[PDB]
């Protein structure tokens, strides 16, 4: 009680107001310090409560006090981290899942659990949960209601508590009446701290798996109700909305979408349980377009891990071959790799032939979800990738390739390339991927402006997003790590990577400051992309006297100079006053200032990784510069290079003086928060 | 619509050597008992 | 500024070579030992009878330079 009360009187705003009253508020440094201190105090107290519950369940009155506290807890729809931990602690408290673990010490564990000896605990927790007093968060009321219902159901199979065996089913009803599924989806899973503690994931997923495992009649009832509601919905649609089923589906897809503990709980839903596989099947039968989106997501979540995704690939592929079915019905499982790959080839043909019955938005949604689901399955099972890439009647690689040159909405392109990457995870796949990308001219590597250039300059600029460019650099990098060929495009023009290079350096990076960001993090992310590729590009560059003697190649009948050791150009750009260099320095100064703000998340993680890649390229230029200067001095391009040292003491445009090094140091002041940039800087 | 290379290579080399000789003169300057005065 | 001047000199010489192309169309161990010597001098960084003659000779040259400058100025006026 004193723990709950002291955490309850600790209001950081109240302390701040008290301190500002006596003028006790120090600098923003000190403000953050005392604030983090108070947050640590509260979090530690809550952690003590939770660890207590994890070691020994709390007594009846302690639990009722915890309930009285939780029944007054508010969200923001997501619940607070401390609020989430309190809810989860009480969750593990009412957790009766240890009664179904076949471990031999069952008697000692049943005698160590306070819920099996003091029936008054059952009576009182039940009477409090069955009070119609709406907890300040009714979704939380329903969440705890479903939890207590599942606990009473799991304890009803032991002969000692039958006086509650009937109040579980109605309780779930009350909880199902309280959008318990929606509360779980938005308030906790939608809370950015849920996936933080693996035990919270295990508790949520345990309750989730127990939902269809302990009360199958309720899942059947929801299925019948959703079917009747789908019928009425169709009646309305043709005549010109409760999303329960979609909600449960999305919940399932998200709760298992991560297995940070790698528990592979999704293995319960596949069958190499029976009710779980049966539901996973029956949901694929006559799947209306409306759930086509959610179901894929659910399937994606179900694929979490090697074995689960393997089972899912098996499920789709088996649903996708030539099999007699349905007593001559028009279509089988609307969720089936047959339906997927078939409608896919259908769209590919309908579009390549129209090179307007544009894809209806709902069809776009279903397609996007399907691509994401297949992406997850391929990502988590290598057997999935091996099976999907080689199914002859789907030819998903070539199908997607045909799709890409066709004018689809950009988002479908994103999802398709995402699946392309998920399949490319196997290196054999990646080899043909490189060749075929070089073949299909998705990017113009052979100019006979059109292509990603115009769409970036007009669409990506206008919509204030550059997803296309991000995918572009992603592909460029995944390919360049796979040893791009030296004669790239030889025969159509000069062999060498220079075209994509100029595209990235002049059009993307050097302009990245002038582009409008609807999501500010996008500027940082795009810089991060360009930087990654330039970095890897230099990182392989070995200075050789071959680079500086301009090799003459007969390309298209004209003698063009062959590209030097890949990084040479980049080095020439860093060894001179190129806008590239000043941009590196400017990003540096800006990151220094932003760090000096000591400010939360916005764009941060990307910002860090960006500046880190920058420092890396700096170190690399310094590293190779000795031999590079030796070789250039040996082969004598009139190109004047200056060792990066003298440049680093350059007079900064913003600073109007040589503070590049001083700024670079200043990150060392941020050590205790950022170890990484400190390491790079000191290097 | 070769000889110069090696020669300008001697050019970069002599530029660097002149820089080094400047550095040597500079350290001798920092050198400036009575004998050094 | 000086290093940037070097980079801009590279730029200008390249631009001049370019306008010459398009429109007008139609030892090392010695260096190493030298670095070692400069570093040695950096490390080093970390008779009353003679002064008469030395002051006398500095004085003699101090007189001579005067005649040199006067010759320069007379050459000027003659020009």
TrEMBL record, chain A:
Spans through the membrane: none
Keyword Nucleus: yes
A GO molecular-function annotation: structural constituent of nuclear pore
UniProtKB keywords: Nucleus, Transport
Compartment(s): Nucleus
Keyword field contains Nucleus: yes
Superkingdom of the organism of origin: Eukaryota
GO terms, biological process: nuclear pore organization
Gene Ontology CC entries for this record: nuclear pore inner ring
Family: Belongs to the NUP186/NUP192/NUP205 family.
Protein name per UniProt: MGC83295 protein
Name of encoding gene: nup205.S
Residues of the full protein shown: 184 to 915 of 2011
Automatic annotation (TrEMBL), chain B:
Parent-protein residues present: 449 to 498 of 547
Name of the protein in question: Nuclear pore glycoprotein p62
Function summary: Essential component of the nuclear pore complex. The N-terminal is probably involved in nucleocytoplasmic transport. The C-terminal is involved in protein-protein interaction probably via coiled-coil formation, promotes its association with centrosomes and may function in anchorage of p62 to the pore complex. Plays a role in mitotic cell cycle progression by regulating centrosome segregation, centriole maturation and spindle orientation. It might be involved in protein recruitment to the centrosome after nuclear breakdown.
UniProt source species: Xenopus laevis (African clawed frog)
Similarity section: Belongs to the nucleoporin NSP1/NUP62 family.
Subcellular location: Cytoplasm, Cytoskeleton, Microtubule organizing center, Centrosome; Cytoplasm, Cytoskeleton, Spindle pole; Nucleus, Nuclear pore complex
UniProtKB/TrEMBL annotation, chain C:
Family classification: Belongs to the NUP54 family.
Official protein name in the record: 54 kDa nucleoporin
Assembly notes: Component of the p62 complex, a complex composed of NUP62, NUP54, and the isoform p58 and isoform p45 of NUP58. Interacts with NUTF2.
Source organism, top-level taxon: Eukaryota
Residues of the full protein shown: 403 to 520 of 535
Nup54 C-terminal interacting domain residues: 47-78
The protein's role, per its UniProt record: Component of the nuclear pore complex, a complex required for the trafficking across the nuclear membrane.
Compartment(s) of residence: Nucleus membrane; Nucleus, Nuclear pore complex
């Amino acid at each position: 009680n004193k723990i709950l009360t002291l955490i309850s009187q600790i209001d950081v705003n109240n302390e701040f107001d008290k301190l500002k009253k006596e003028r006790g508020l120090g600098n923003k440094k000190h403000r953050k310090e005392v604030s983090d201190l108070i947050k640590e105090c509260q979090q530690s107290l809550a952690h003590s409560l939770y660890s207590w519950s994890c070691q020994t369940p709390l007594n009846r009155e302690d639990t009722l006090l915890l309930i009285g506290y939780l029944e007054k807890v508010t969200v923001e729809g997501s619940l607070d981290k401390v609020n989430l931990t309190l809810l989860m602690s009480l969750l593990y408290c009412l957790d009766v899942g240890f009664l179904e673990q076949g471990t031999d010490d069952r008697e000692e564990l049943m005698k160590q659990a306070s819920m099996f000896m003091d029936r008054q605990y059952i009576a009182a927790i039940h009477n409090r949960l069955q009070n119609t007093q709406p907890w300040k968060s009714p979704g939380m009321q329903a969440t705890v209601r479903l939890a207590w219902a599942l606990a009473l159901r799991g304890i009803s199979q032991f002969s000692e508590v039958l006086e509650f065996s009937e109040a579980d089913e109605p309780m779930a009803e009350i909880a199902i009446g309280g959008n318990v599924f929606l509360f779980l989806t938005e308030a906790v899973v939608g809370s950015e701290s849920f996936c933080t503690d693996e035990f919270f994931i295990r508790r949520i997923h345990k309750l989730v798996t127990d939902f269809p495992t302990l009360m199958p009649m309720k899942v059947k009832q929801l299925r019948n109700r959703a079917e009747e509601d789908a019928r009425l919905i169709q009646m309305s649609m043709q005549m010109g909305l409760r999303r329960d089923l979609e909600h449960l589906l999305l919940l399932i897809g998200e709760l298992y979408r991560k297995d940070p503990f790698h528990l592979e709980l999704a293995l319960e839903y596949w069958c190499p349980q029976v009710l779980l596989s049966k539901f996973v099947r029956q949901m694929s039968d006559l799947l209306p377009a409306t759930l086509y989106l959610p179901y894929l997501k659910m399937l994606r979540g179900l694929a979490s891990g090697p074995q689960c995704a393997h089972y899912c690939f098996s499920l789709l592929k088996a649903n996708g071959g030539s099999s007699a079915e349905n007593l001559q019905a028009a279509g089988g499982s609307p969720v089936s790799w047959d339906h997927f790959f078939h409608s896919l080839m259908l769209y590919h043909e309908h579009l390549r032939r129209d090179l307007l019955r544009g894809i209806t938005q709902r069809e776009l949604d279903g397609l996007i979800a399907c691509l994401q689901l297949t992406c997850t399955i391929i990502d988590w099972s290598e057997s999935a990738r091996l099976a999907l890439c080689e199914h002859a009647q789907w030819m998903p690689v070539v199908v997607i390739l045909g799709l890409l040159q066709c004018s689809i909405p950009p988002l479908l392109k994103a999802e398709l390339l995402k699946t392309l990457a998920a399949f490319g995870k196997s290196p054999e796949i990646a080899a043909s991927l490189w060749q075929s990308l070089e073949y299909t001219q998705i990017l113009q590597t052979v100019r006979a402006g059109v292509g990603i250039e115009v769409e970036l300059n007009e669409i990506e600029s206008r919509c204030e997003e550059y997803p296309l460019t991000r995918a572009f650099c992603q592909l460029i990098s995944t390919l360049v790590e796979s040893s791009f060929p030296t004669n790239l495009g030889a025969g159509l023009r000069a062999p060498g990577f220079e075209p994509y290079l100029q595209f990235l350096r002049d059009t993307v990076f050097l302009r990245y400051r002038t582009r409008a960001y609807r999501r500010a993090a996008e500027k940082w992310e795009v810089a991060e992309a360009v930087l990654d590729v330039f970095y890897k590009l230099l990182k392989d560059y070995e200075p050789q006297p071959e680079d500086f003697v301009d090799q003459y190649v007969e390309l298209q009948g004209e003698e063009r100079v062959a590209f030097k050791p890949p990084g040479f150009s980049l080095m020439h750009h860093l060894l001179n006053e190129s806008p590239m260099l000043e941009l590196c320095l400017s990003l540096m100064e800006e990151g220094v200032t932003q760090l000096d703000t000591y400010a939360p998340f916005p764009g941060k993680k990307h910002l860090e990784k960006a500046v880190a890649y920058c420092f890396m390229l700096l170190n690399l230029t310094l590293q190779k510069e000795n031999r590079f200067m030796d070789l250039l001095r040996e082969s004598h391009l009139s190109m004047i290079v200056t060792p990066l040292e003298q440049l680093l003491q350059g007079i900064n445009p913003r600073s109007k003086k040589a503070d590049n090094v001083v700024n670079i140091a200043r990150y060392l002041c941020h050590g205790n928060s950022n170890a990484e940039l400190a390491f790079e800087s000191a290097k | 619509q070769k000889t110069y290379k090696l020669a300008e290579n001697i050019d970069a080399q002599l530029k660097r050597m002149a820089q080094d000789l400047k550095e040597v003169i500079e350290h001798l300057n920092t050198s400036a008992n009575p004998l050094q005065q | 500024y000086k290093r940037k001047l070097m980079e801009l000199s590279h730029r200008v010489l390249q631009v001049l070579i370019k306008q010459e192309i398009q429109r007008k169309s139609g030892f090392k161990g010695r260096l190493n030992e030298l670095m070692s010597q400069i570093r040695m001098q950096n490390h080093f960084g970390a008779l009353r009878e003679i002064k008469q003659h030395l002051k006398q000779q500095q004085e003699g040259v101090s007189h001579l330079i005067s005649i040199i400058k006067d010759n320069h100025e007379d050459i000027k006026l003659i020009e």
